[PDB]
Amino acid sequence: MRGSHHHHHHGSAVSAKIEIYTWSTCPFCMRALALLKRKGVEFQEYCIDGDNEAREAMAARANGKRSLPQIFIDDQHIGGCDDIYALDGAGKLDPLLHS
Secondary structure (H helix, E strand, C coil), rough: CCCCCCCCCCCCCCCCCCEEECCCCHHHHHHHHHHHHCCCCCCCEEEEEHHHHHHHHHHHHHHCCCCCCCEEEEEEEEEEEHHHHHHHHCCCHHHHHCC
């Protein structure tokens, strides 16, 4: 296992689980995506263009909300575009990512 390895009882390597539900052409979704992209983190986008079933799945997790986008970090609902930009403005988003 040649290389420079960090040890601190990590066990199986796992990282932050970051999810965002979008319509590809929604300007608020686009703005949220840009922020996540600028952070350089790895994330999963659920592009649900025209998919009503997926929207209902989203609503079930997002406090019944059907507005877009909806963002989750480590299974916690963070909210929408304004919520994530607000967090960043307060210096609270990097810790969630989690740095």
